[PDB]
Structure formats: structure tokens, C-alpha cells
């Protein structure tokens, strides 16, 4: 019944959870993923996953598609690798560092590599209920000190045979994928930006896209103390799927402003990735999140949250199209900097 | 009084100050920097800055060397290019992002360049005091807001100027050309960045660079688990006679004792990642989070842990057996930036 809990609840309700709690944990070989948001503790609305790896020569896992998840995958410390194709277009590729972003819509082949010793990726996934997969793939972790992974080549995970035999986990293998060896400086194919200019959202559904820390669009919210929006999924990309994905930056609430209170029709989540982040929700005390910590609240509960840091980050998922960031979005102006203004 | 403090104290006693607190901010241009730690706070002993900055198609300093500081560049988050040479060794750059190190000993060349939009960069400089040159160098920010940052010439003083800045340690170098062969985010080519172990220099004077995670690391179980990752040792320091690393951190276990610590040297942390709980000396317990930093006077008695699973800090200390080399001392040679799983 308190706020905090080890393992996402196996119901909606309010609830924190802290960076590295349990959060049934399963490791697939090198791998350790943690499951903040499931689709039991959301309604099926999201999944908001935590894979802690070490640097592996080999991919991540062999390239595949889901048909019915829209996949998500946020850098949240160290380095890797993503790659994925939609339909007929040219196949790109990104490496991912802290703060980076990228978006696989539903259809499209994709696969990942682990470059940093201590890489942490974020993985959003729509609707809920795809971690079936990982529990299923996966070993169950005790991980009695909550160590980020287990201290200690083949392609991790499952083998060409096993991962065609998943269907029903909504995994489709795509082994005629064959992942380009041509990047230079975190990208290819040459012809794209990646830490060297503004990123753009793709211009409809389907498409992949990625966006590198800081380089996409951002807006200014300024009608509770200073909020900048970087919207990573908007109802253009969601569609159906039906959910926004951003990362929110925010400054202190000036003494003169009453930080409000929100009640969405969508259940949402939040994971701090900068800064210290103060949230009150429904009658539970008012609790600090600091780096990797994860909020969630249902649809319908009342909730208040402010930055307790000078500057915070947090990423940011909503189930609806009329979430949080897009509120502070629509209720703001377009924006040019990471940085909020100097003077209130 | 409080132990939080909004600017770093004007004498030894110690303090918390939060990230991006006022830190007696000046701009220079488009760089905004903080003093967390300066030669008043310190007793002279180090000076620990933030500089926040958006991309730049240009130099964020001219090319200069110090006599007599050893300059230490930390990434806390976005990117930046650094370039050093010593001598006639050949020229060494790498692009840091989060988490990345490069060290610049006592007459070694350098200059950096801001890449991405929210980049932070944390300097390490001993001894202390080398501020005053921001000072003079830069303009008074009142920074209201405390925004990181106020939202193609050389960033600083032009070439004139900064060959006029000698009484601050400052040498100019207008002669350098940063070379313009990088490739994944390195050069010459043959470096290892980001793809294969970094070793300290073992040549007092030359630069080197260390890539997140990828340095020689230490576990020490004595008092729940913690991991060193050394950035500078007596090797490097020797008469500035201080070290530099990451210390990350389990949590203590109900079973073991969180223990007292004292130095002679004055030391300090700021948080990288994780909530690390300081008590020090007379003061309250404080919980500290991003970029928070702890300072320590030498002869105080302190504590620290971990309220979080994992926390990793960046750690400073005058002297060559503070908190630091003690740990790695009382430790082993260890291949993992993750600990046990087991206690
Ligand atoms: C991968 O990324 C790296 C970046 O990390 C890319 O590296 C850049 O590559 C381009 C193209 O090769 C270089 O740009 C060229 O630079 C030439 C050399 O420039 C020096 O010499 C000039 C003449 O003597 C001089 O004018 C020039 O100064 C100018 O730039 C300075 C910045 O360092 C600045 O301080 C000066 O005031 C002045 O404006 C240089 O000293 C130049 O002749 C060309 O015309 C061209 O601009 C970059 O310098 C490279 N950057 C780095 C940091 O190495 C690489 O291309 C990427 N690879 C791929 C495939 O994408
Ligand atoms: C900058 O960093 C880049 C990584 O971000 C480096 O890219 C790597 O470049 C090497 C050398 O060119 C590639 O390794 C080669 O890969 C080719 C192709 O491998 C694929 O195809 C074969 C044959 O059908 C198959 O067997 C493989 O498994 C692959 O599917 C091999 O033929 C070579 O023998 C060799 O392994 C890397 O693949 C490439 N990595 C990536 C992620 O692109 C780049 O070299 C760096 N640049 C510089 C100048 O240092
Ligand atoms: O289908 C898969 C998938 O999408 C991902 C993934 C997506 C986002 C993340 O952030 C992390 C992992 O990993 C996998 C690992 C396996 O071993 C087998 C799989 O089928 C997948
Ligand atoms: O001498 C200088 C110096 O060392 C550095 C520096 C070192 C470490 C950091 O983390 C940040 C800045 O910046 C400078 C900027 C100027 O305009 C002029 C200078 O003379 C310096
Ligand atoms: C994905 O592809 C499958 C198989 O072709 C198709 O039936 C389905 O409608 C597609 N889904 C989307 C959202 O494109
Ligand atoms: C992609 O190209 C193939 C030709 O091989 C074609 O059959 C298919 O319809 C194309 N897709 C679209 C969106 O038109
Ligand atoms: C759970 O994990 C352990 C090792 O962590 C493994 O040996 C075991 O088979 C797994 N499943 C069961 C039934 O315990
Ligand atoms: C989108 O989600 C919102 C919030 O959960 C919900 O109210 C709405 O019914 C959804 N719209 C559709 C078409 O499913
Ligand atoms: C630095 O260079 C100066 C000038 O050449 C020299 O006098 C001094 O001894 C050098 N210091 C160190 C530590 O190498
Ligand atoms: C800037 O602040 C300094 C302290 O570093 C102070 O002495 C000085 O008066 C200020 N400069 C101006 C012009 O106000
Ligand atoms: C190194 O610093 C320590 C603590 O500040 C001090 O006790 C000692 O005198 C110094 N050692 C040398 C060799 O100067
Ligand atoms: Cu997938
Ligand atoms: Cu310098």
C-alpha cells in the first residue's frame, strides 16, 4: 500500500519505483532488463524498461519486428548501437549516447549493439505487455545487491531457430536483415544528422527516426515556472498507438506560483534522468526521484510535481494524445535552446 | 548555520552546494561558468568549476598551456572536443561525452571546442584559486533562474589578449593548430577511444584521456561495494600531491557500519549519478543528488553512502592517500563498472 514499491504493482495504482529495484528482473545472458512500468501495473497502456550491458562484440539480439509495438529506445548512460529499416527505404543507423533517442514504429526490422561498459538503455514500449517476451527469454534475477548488471561472441539472445518461433510474443524474425558496416562518427549512411545538426520527428507514422540529445524541436512552457518540452513521439508518429513520448526539462517554481495540480485521461510515467524531482500523487506523501527513479500515475489520480533541482530532465510517456507534455506544448511557444531564460 | 550553501563559502568550513547554484556565475561569451569549489573555499588546495555551453563552430579558448596548474576536463553530459599536446609528442584530441575524462598536466598545449547543445564540463584544477582569471575574464551573471546556461570568433580573450594573462598561470599558444583529422571522435588514428581499455599515462607530463568505463578499476568490499576508477594517481600528480577518480557505490548493508573518515587533505564529490547521503563534521546528514557537490576540510571527520542502488561520484583530494587511494588500497584489481550480486 505505501508508494514505494520493489516490483511494479500487478495493478494500476500510483506508484514509485527506484533505479535498480528489482523490478522482476530477468537477465538474457549479459543483459539485466527491469520492469518499471509493466503492462499489469499500467492497464497495458506502456512499458518502461531498464537493459543494464556490458560492451559486446557481437548485436544485441538478432534483427526482428514487432507488428502490433511500437518500440522506443532512450540512451540513459554509456553507448550502443540501433539499427532499423521500414519497408523499402534506405536502412540507417545511429549510435545512441547519454540523452539520445530513437523511435521504431510498429513494421520496422531493427536490432541493437552495446558499445559502453556501463550502458543503460530506456526502453519504451506501446501498448503494455510486450515484457511477456523477456520473461519468457529471459532468466529470472535475484540480484541480491541490485548491482546494474551482472559483472563478467555470439549474437545475445535468441538463436536464428528460436527467435522465428515467437509470433506469438509479437516478435517476427527478419534474418535476410543485414546490419550496415559503414558507420562513421556515431552514423550512416553518410547522408544524415547526428550530433551535427537539428533531427526532425519523421513526417507520418511507420518511419524510424532518431533524435540526438538536445537536436530536436523543443518548446518553452513558462505557466508554472520554466518547462522545456522535447517531444519525441506526437499523435503524427503514435497514431492508434495513441500516446506522446517527450523528455520535460524544468527549473525551480518561483515562490509566487502555485505549482499545479494535473488529472489526465491517460495513465503516464516519468523517469528522471538530470536533477531531483519532487512528485505528490493522489493522498501519498510528496517524494523526491532522483537519477533513474520512475513515477507512474493512473489515469483519473490527481497529481503535482516540481523540481526540487535548479535544473532537471526527466523522460516522459502518456497513454492519449492530450498528456502532460503536449499540454505544456500547446500551452507554450516553440523554442530554440535547452537552456530556459535567465529571468523570470 | 546551513550546510547548503548558494556560492562557495569565502573560508575552509564545510558546505554543499547544489548543481547550478550561483557559484559566483560569470559569462564568458556564451559560456556560463560556476565555482563549486575555489581556492578561498579550498584553502587553496583545488578548484572544481562547471561550465555550461551550447554548440560552438568555434574554439571555445585559444590554445594556451599552464606552468604551474594540472587541469583536469570532466563531461557530466553533452560533448566537447579537447585537444593537447606535450613537447613534440605528437598531438592527441578525443570528443568526451558523458562520463569521459582527459587529463592536462603542467606544460601540455590545449584547447576545447563545445559540440553538443546541452553540454556540461567539469574542471578539476590544482592547486586552487585559479579562478580569479574567470573573474576577470568573465562578466557577473546574476542568472535569476539558475538556467545552465543564458539561452564564428574564438570564444574568450582574442590573441593579444590572451597573451597578457601570464600573472594568472595562462601561456599563450597561437602558433597550435588543433589538428583536423578526427575520426570517431579521435586522433591520430590507432588511438583507442571508446573501444578498448585506457591506461593512465605512465610518463609524468604527457596528456591522456579516459573513456567512461573503460580505465583500470578497483573493488573494495570492506564497507558494502564500492569501484575506483583512478584518474589521476601520484604517478601522475607528484608534487601537485593530489588524486582524481569516479567512486561508485552500492548501498551499505544493514550489517556493516557506515564508517568515519578523516584526511589531512581537504577533499570534495560531486554526484554523477545516484543519491549519495554526506554527513560531515557538526552538520546534518545531506542527501545529495546530479551534480551535487560535498566539500570536506582537511582533519573533519565525515561519512557517506549510497541511499540509492548505484551511485557514482566524481572525487578530488589534496594529498596522496585521501578516501580514494585508500579504497584502492584496501581493494582489488577489478574488470566490471557493476559489483557483485552477491554480498
Ligand atoms: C567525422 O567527424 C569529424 C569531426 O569530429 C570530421 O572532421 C572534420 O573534417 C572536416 C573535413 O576534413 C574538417 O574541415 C576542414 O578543415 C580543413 C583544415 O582546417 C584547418 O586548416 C585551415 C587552413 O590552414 C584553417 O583555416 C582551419 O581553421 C579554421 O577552423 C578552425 C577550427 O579548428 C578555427 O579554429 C579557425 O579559426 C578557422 O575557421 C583549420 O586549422 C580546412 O582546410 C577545410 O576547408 C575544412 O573546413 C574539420 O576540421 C574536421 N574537424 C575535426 C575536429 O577534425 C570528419 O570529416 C567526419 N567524418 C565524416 C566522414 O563525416
Ligand atoms: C569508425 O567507427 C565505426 C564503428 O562505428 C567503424 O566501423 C566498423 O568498420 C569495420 C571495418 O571496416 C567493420 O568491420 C568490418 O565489417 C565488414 C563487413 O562485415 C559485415 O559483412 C560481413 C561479410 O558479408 C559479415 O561477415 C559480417 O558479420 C558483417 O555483417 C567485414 O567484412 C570486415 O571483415 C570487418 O569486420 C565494422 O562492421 C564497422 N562497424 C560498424 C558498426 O559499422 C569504423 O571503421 C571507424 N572508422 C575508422 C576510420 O576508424
Ligand atoms: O524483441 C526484442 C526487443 O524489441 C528488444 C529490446 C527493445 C528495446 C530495448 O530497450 C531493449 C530491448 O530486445 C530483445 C532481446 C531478445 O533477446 C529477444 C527479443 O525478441 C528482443
Ligand atoms: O586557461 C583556461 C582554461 O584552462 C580553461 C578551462 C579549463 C577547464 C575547464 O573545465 C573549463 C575551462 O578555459 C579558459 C577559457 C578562457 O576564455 C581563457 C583561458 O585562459 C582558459
Ligand atoms: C504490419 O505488417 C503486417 C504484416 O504485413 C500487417 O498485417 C499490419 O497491418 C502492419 N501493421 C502496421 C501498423 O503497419
Ligand atoms: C515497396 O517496393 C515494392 C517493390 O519491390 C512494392 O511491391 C511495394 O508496394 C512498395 N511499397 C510501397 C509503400 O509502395
Ligand atoms: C531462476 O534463476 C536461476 C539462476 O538465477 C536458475 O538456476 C533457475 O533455473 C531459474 N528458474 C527457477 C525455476 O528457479
Ligand atoms: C487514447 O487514450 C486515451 C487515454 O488513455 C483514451 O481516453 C482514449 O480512448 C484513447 N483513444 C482511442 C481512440 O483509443
Ligand atoms: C614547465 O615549463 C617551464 C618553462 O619551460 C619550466 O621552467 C618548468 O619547469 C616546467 N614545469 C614542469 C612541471 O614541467
Ligand atoms: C563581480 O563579482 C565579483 C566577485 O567575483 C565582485 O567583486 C565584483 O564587484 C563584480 N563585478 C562587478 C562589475 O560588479
Ligand atoms: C600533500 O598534501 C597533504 C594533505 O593536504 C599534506 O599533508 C602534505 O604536506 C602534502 N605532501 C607533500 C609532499 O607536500
Ligand atoms: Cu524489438
Ligand atoms: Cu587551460
Not at 509495438?69 to 549516447?97: D, I, M, P
Not at 528460436?162 to 547522408?191: H, K, M
Not at 493522489?282 to 535544473?311: N, Q, R, W
Amino acid at each position: 500500500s505505501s508508494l514505494i514499491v520493489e516490483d511494479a504493482p500487478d495493478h494500476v495504482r500510483p506508484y514509485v519505483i527506484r533505479h535498480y529495484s528489482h523490478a522482476r528482473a530477468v537477465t538474457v545472458d549479459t543483459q539485466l532488463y527491469r520492469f518499471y512500468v509493466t503492462g499489469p501495473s499500467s492497464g497495458y497502456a506502456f512499458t518502461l524498461m531498464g537493459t543494464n550491458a556490458p560492451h559486446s562484440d557481437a548485436l544485441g539480439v538478432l534483427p526482428h519486428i514487432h507488428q502490433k509495438h511500437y518500440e522506443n529506445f532512450y540512451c540513459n548512460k554509456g553507448s550502443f548501437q540501433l539499427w532499423a529499416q521500414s519497408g523499402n527505404e534506405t536502412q540507417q543507423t545511429r549510435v545512441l549516447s547519454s540523452g539520445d533517442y530513437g523511435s521504431v514504429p510498429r513494421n520496422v526490422t531493427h536490432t541493437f549493439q552495446i558499445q559502453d561498459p556501463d550502458t543503460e538503455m530506456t526502453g519504451v514500449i506501446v501498448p503494455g505487455g510486450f515484457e511477456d517476451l523477456f520473461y519468457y527469454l529471459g532468466t529470472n534475477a535475484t540480484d541480491t545487491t541490485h548491482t546494474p548488471y551482472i559483472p563478467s561472441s555470439s549474437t545475445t539472445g535468441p538463436d536464428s531457430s528460436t527467435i522465428s518461433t515467437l509470433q506469438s510474443f509479437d516478435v517476427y524474425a527478419e534474418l535476410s536483415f543485414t546490419p550496415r558496416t559503414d558507420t562513421v562518427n556515431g552514423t550512416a549512411p553518410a547522408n544524415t544528422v547526428w550530433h551535427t545538426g537539428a533531427n526532425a520527428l519523421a513526417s507520418t507514422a511507420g518511419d524510424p527516426y532518431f533524435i540526438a540529445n538536445g537536436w530536436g524541436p523543443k518548446y518553452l512552457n513558462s505557466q508554472y515556472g520554466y518547462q522545456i518540452v522535447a517531444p519525441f513521439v506526437t499523435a503524427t508518429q503514435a497514431q492508434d498507438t495513441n500516446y506522446t513520448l517527450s523528455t520535460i526539462s524544468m527549473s525551480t517554481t518561483p515562490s509566487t506560483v502555485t505549482v499545479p495540480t494535473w488529472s489526465f485521461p491517460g495513465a503516464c510515467a516519468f523517469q528522471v534522468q538530470e536533477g531531483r524531482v519532487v512528485v505528490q500523487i493522489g493522498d501519498y506523501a510528496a517524494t523526491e526521484l532522483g537519477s533513474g527513479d520512475v513515477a507512474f500515475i493512473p489515469g483519473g489520480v490527481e497529481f503535482k510535481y516540481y523540481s526540487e533541482a535548479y535544473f532537471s530532465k526527466v523522460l516522459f510517456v502518456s497513454s492519449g494524445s492530450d498528456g502532460l507534455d503536449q499540454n505544456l506544448v500547446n500551452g507554450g511557444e516553440e523554442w530554440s535552446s535547452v537552456s530556459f531564460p535567465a529571468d523570470w
